[model samples]
Target: MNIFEMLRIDEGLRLKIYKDTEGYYTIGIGHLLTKSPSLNAAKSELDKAIGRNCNGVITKDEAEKLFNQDVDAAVRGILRNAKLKPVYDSLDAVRRCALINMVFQMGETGVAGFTNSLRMLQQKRWDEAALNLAKSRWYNQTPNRAKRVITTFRTGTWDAYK
Candidate 1:
């Protein structure tokens, strides 16, 4: 089996919210809870659970709300970080959106760890940036997603690998 399928088995699938071994609230596969501004914005979701005396169970709607808040905050953080603003604005729509997705998944600081790739991106070196992206640990963990980012920038547009 592939790594993702293995990850699913190892992480275990759970539609409902549950506490991980360390007992921090988590939900929807292996998504861990954090006390970020995005999570704070979803305080009402927590309040709803508490109001119902539900500690480790949330509706799918609540999960979606939390996800949306996190994604929005991540995107805003990327745009706000001065170091990334220029690169972000210079990108084409597909590349811009792909970078936003990367930020959403990895956070701005996390993406910054890809220093070489980020430099290539800032320098508009598409081929080198794609190569750097393919060589990352993130690419090893999420090949399909990494491919999406690489392909989008390489072609100057979104092109799903068939």
Candidate 2:
């Protein structure tokens, strides 16, 4: 019911390696192996996480660690953003989770471009914020995911068992 569990379900866990929707090599809760220091570094850490030569497979525990790393990165990224700081602070837990989810998927820098929506949300203009978000290409590109996010943003409610 927390953001962690919500994102794990939202991202969809795959302990085994697979190509993502964008054809990138990904694994373990949308970890992008295709964009990295190199396959050498990725493979070594992944193998270390699984405690062996994983052969494109990982344990749930390893996946959990990777997911935690990703989430922490998103959290830090969001908090460090000057433009997002006030907006983020004004949000309640559920709405903050929505912002974090967007950041998790798109990075704080990427999500930062939605200034209008963020401003509206910051002002507690839920309907205006939701509409601005819906007008975005981010919404167009991932309607299902963005719809849930916009709903959560507008209602201050978790889509899960909150």
Candidate 3:
């Protein structure tokens, strides 16, 4: 079965991913919600989980809040509901959104989050486009996700993002 079907992505799951991700940016990393934590720890967590800062370790509380507390549960809770209307229905839309959410959760200053990927997509350089996905500053952050999205990018099938 194709990966998106295998994952059984629905609408609600997409929104949950968005909400959980937004929360991470809001409360966890930005410290715009709270005082900024140790920069080193913050950057590390971003690199590992979301590919944002690429520097330090996020607080135990922030990590727990983003990964376990919010995103994970939100994803499961929404899985059984009808798929929400994603902001973008195209395969590229879904993949890009997912990539952005993950990076946002990890940290800010998320350079590789979208710039190059969008350029390639706009140019319709499918193969080069996939490689660009691999070059994410947060490349190793979420291995499974990174690989899956990159594969989808290469195919230009437009279904993976759905």
Candidate 4:
């Protein structure tokens, strides 16, 4: 089966919006519904869908479809809304994916706020970008995840960060 099918099964389809393990409002194949700009909209949609905040149910196939759409929008936003879009296109796919991952988690605004990191990236100074990333608030909050991203910037190996 394709990776999307595998991921849907692995993440487990949830029809109703509920708090995930991390306490984020989530639904439909583990999509986090609490990200800004869309959090309230998701909640509204969920309420409209099932008339309740956390008790709606959907089929696995339906959840998978929703997940795909959400992912597509997110990727589009990263490409269109990212402050470093020009720089992003110049990087290899591996590096581009790494930044996209970061943008997904942190939002375009959050990523844009990393002035020094963006500067380093624009300069193609991978080491400097990695070092600056290691010292950011994001790094302080999630050291292991930051380390992996930093490593990805420092070395382009697809799986090395993992």
User: Which prediction has the highest lDDT against the true structure?
Assistant: 2
lDDT leaderboard ranking = 2, 4, 1, 3
Best by TM-score: 2
* Global fold similarity of model 3 (TM-score): 0.36
- In the range 1-162, model 2's lDDT, one tens digit per residue, is 788888877789998877676566678987777655455656765676567898788888888888999989888888899988888999999999889899988777878899888889999999998888999777887788788888999898775334
> Over the stretch 39-66, how does candidate 3's per-residue lDDT look in tens digits?
4443444565644542433454544444
Model 3 CA lDDT for position 161: 48
Worst 10 residues of 3 by lDDT: 10-19
Q: lDDT per prediction?
A: 0.64, 0.82, 0.43, 0.67
If scored against the real structure, what TM-score would every candidate get? Answer: 0.68, 0.86, 0.36, 0.69
Residue 100 of candidate 4: its Cα lDDT?
Answer: 66
- Residues forming the 10-long window of minimal summed lDDT in candidate 4: 1-10
Clash numbers, per candidate: 0, 0, 14, 1
The alpha-carbon lDDT assigned to residue 138 of candidate 1 equals: 78
List the lowest-lDDT window of 10 residues for candidate 1: 1-10
Error of 2 at 50 (Å): 6.6
lDDT of 1 by residue, 53-84 (tens): 44556666665555556556767887898867
Candidate 1 achieves a global lDDT of 0.64
